[PDB]
Every structure is written in structure tokens, then in C-alpha cells.
Design a protein around this ligand. Structure first.
Ligand SMILES: O=C(CCCC[C@@H]1SC[C@@H]2NC(=O)N[C@@H]21)N[C@H]1CCNC1
Length: 115
């Protein structure tokens, strides 16, 4: 249980932010705001849901809200590092229906509580 430490506002290297509540039971809930240049569904909140087990975290965002539907979703999997300069290091998949078949994009996001 990395509850009090995970809970808060985070920023990745693309300038995207999420705000999350980590319950004692391991529920992750909150909102994600994408600001990655050239992508869809930016600058409005999307629902974040996921699960954590100690330092091990996973959450997903469906890119559909009352503002914009990008017919896609992302899952993040990684580890929380507490203490001075606390970090969430993640691998993500961004999946959607491509022209020929199911698409997957892959990347790494590094999250800090520094704005
Ligand atoms: O472009 C999108 C939806 C927005 C994706 C934002 C990505 S998720 C991983 C990375 N981290 C972050 O903070 N922002 C980016 N969806 C569709 C449009 C057409 N094909 C994918």
C-alpha cells in the first residue's frame, strides 16, 4: 500500500497531468488530461481507473468524454518510487481500430509531482 504518496497530481514529460486517489484497498480513481502535442482528446478531463499493489500500479483511460470521443484507450503499467523526487515510471499501450486491423502504439511516460 503506497496510498499516501501515489494520491496527488502528477505530470509526465509531454506536459500531461493526472490527479488520482489511491484507496487503502488498492482502487485508483481520478482524471487524466492529455497535452501531448499532435494527439487527440487534449485539454479536457478523461476518467482514470486502475489498481495498485504496493509500488506496482496500472491504470487505463478511455478517450471518450462529453467533449471529444477519439475511439481509443491507453493502459499504463509501472512502478512508484517514493521519497525525495518521487516518480511513477510507466510503459503504455494506446490501442484503437486501424484501417487493416487492431492497432497498438507503445511508449514510456515518466511522472513527477513537479508542475
Ligand atoms: O490520440 C489519441 C488519444 C490521446 C492519446 C494521448 C497519449 S496516451 C499515451 C501518451 N501519454 C500522454 O500523456 N499522452 C499520450 N487517440 C487516437 C487518435 C487516433 N489514434 C489514436
Amino acid at each position: 500500500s503506497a496510498e499516501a504518496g501515489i494520491t496527488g497530481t502528477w505530470y509526465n514529460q509531454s506536459g500531461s497531468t493526472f490527479t488520482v486517489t489511491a484507496g487503502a484497498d488498492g482502487n485508483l480513481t481520478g482524471q487524466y488530461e492529455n497535452r501531448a502535442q499532435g494527439t487527440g482528446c487534449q485539454n479536457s478531463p478523461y476518467t482514470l481507473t486502475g489498481r495498485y499493489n504496493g509500488t506496482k500500479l496500472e491504470w487505463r483511460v478511455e478517450w471518450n468524454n462529453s467533449t471529444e470521443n477519439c475511439h481509443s484507450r491507453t493502459e499504463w503499467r509501472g512502478q512508484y518510487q517514493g521519497g525525495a523526487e518521487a516518480r511513477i515510471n510507466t510503459q503504455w499501450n494506446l490501442t484503437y481500430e486501424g484501417g487493416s486491423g487492431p492497432a497498438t502504439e507503445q511508449g514510456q511516460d515518466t511522472f513527477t509531482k513537479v508542475k
